[PDB]
Amino acid sequence: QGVAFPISRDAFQALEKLSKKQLNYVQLEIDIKNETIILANTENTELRDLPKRIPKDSARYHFFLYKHSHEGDYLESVVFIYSMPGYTCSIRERMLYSSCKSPLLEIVERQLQMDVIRKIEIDNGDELTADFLYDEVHPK
Amino acid sequence: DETTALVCDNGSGLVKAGFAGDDAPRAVFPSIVGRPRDSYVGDEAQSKRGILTLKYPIEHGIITNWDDMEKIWHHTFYNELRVAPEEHPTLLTEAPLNPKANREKMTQIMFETFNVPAMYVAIQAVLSLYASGRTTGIVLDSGDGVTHNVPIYEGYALPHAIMRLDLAGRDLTDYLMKILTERGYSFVTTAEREIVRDIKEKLCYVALDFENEMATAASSSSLEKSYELPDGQVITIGNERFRCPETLFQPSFIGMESAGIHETTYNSIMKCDIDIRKDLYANNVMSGGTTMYPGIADRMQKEITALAPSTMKIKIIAPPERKYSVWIGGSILASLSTFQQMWITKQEYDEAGPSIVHRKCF
Ligand SMILES: Nc1ncnc2c1ncn2[C@@H]1O[C@H](COP(=O)(O)OP(=O)(O)OP(=O)(O)O)[C@@H](O)[C@H]1O
Ligand SMILES: [Ca+2]
């Protein structure tokens, strides 16, 4: 169950900006040996560029601002993404990303009042098509 | 380090115990206690069976006999690991559907009988799920005495949906023993059953299509494999190779009311909220020794796909380390410096009592 790794000041500041909608994408990684969550990428990301942000060889955490219409409303929905490409990740890498997930999500809610509307887990970036994001957030 | 964290995966057939930080358990022995007709555990209890009443303290993953379970843990600490448990934090595993009172009992035995400085309890299925690289999915854990279908959502198992099949490696070994015994080759004693268990783990496989494979075996010897027995004799097995693990999909082969592991998976998923069914279908994670059969992931893949809705991506994840994925998962957890503040300490137990395990571990 839940293991809490410290978050870098940088990673925390980028998540603080994403909660204030100043950034639309924050990718985080676990520094496995130092047991820390660090900042990996904060590029401006629209839904069409999102598939091309997901590494192919290593697991990652992503916070993405999903802007879309749903029954007449326009929603800016912060979504959480746990990408795990497969056996390229060691058992230790796979275990740390799974165990560190909940505490990171609790700290982000408790401190930054980020409203994570959905938590998604994917094998690879090519899955993050517009329809897929819509079916995860609004499964009907 | 004289205080290295310990990991004990208490299975109904085998105890996998070791040190946090290692890649594999240092100790693997049978969960058997023999008391005279003061006590014996493991291999020696089985050996002295002529003067003992043998017992399995872990019935279908659940610890049902605590006086006996204490004997297993005592043997684990002093005879297997050769450590004093009062100086090592101990991570323990628990079965799916393990009663909350049972979890409390385990905590009290660790702190009052063994005097451990700290302890942790994790569900076997969740550790295998986490080590696979995800937090939501359905786990098929098939071990020695029990097989479970466990839907897990964000690290929490869904008890209402968990399915239990009381059929696992123990039964498949018995079935292969009977199907070999009746075609000539006669195995009877506990040691001859161990030869059968070895034949089963080395030569058995799951057929993608059972009736097609029965036909291939009837018309040719393409599916035959040989095995040299300890005395030097060579035996050759044909359809027994796949008829034996086929019992997982057709439990009626050994007179069971329970449908196959593909149907109990479908049933388990159908008991959960329609909104999460897609996440379960795309993450069927296998774990346990009885999931080591070649061809089993391919077979589960086609069987789930034949029952599931046609708009579900069906994915079977079968890690190569799945025979020990529970122990390895716990080993990684307990080896972390940041895990130090997750343990239930003796002091926290003395103040709150055993119901601390529901909050601090879950
Ligand atoms: N390669 C293999 N192929 C098939 N079966 C195997 C293989 N390796 C081990 N087994 C069987 O798996 C069983 C042991 O698996 P496991 O350690 O997960 O069980 P357990 O934890 O003791 O039981 P359970 O989870 O049912 O309570 C034995 O019956 C053993 O014969
Ligand atoms: Ca087990």
Author numbering:
A (entry chain B): 176 to 315
B (entry chain A): 3 to 39, 51 to 375
What does the literature reporting this entry say, word for word?
The actin cytoskeleton is a force-generating machinery involved in many processes of eukaryotic cells, such as migration, morphogenesis, cytokinesis, and endocytosis. Actin filaments within actin networks assemble from a pool of globular actin monomers (G-actin), and the polymerization reaction against cellular membranes is one of the physiological mechanisms by which actin networks exert forces.
We therefore incubated a third ATP analog, N6-(6-Amino)hexyl-ATP-ATTO-488 (referred to in the subsequent parts of the article as ATP-ATTO-488), with G-actin. It triggered a clear increase of fluorescence anisotropy, demonstrating that this ATP analog is capable of binding to actin. To further study the mechanism by which ATP-ATTO-488 interacts with actin, we co-crystallized ATP-ATTO-488 actin monomer in complex with an actin-depolymerizing factor homology domain of twinfilin, and solved the structure by molecular replacement. Importantly, electron density for the ATP part of the ATP-ATTO-488 molecule was clearly visible and resided in an almost identical position as compared to ATP in the previous structure. However, its dissociation rate from actin is approximately three times slower, and this may be due to weak interactions of the fluorescent dye with actin.
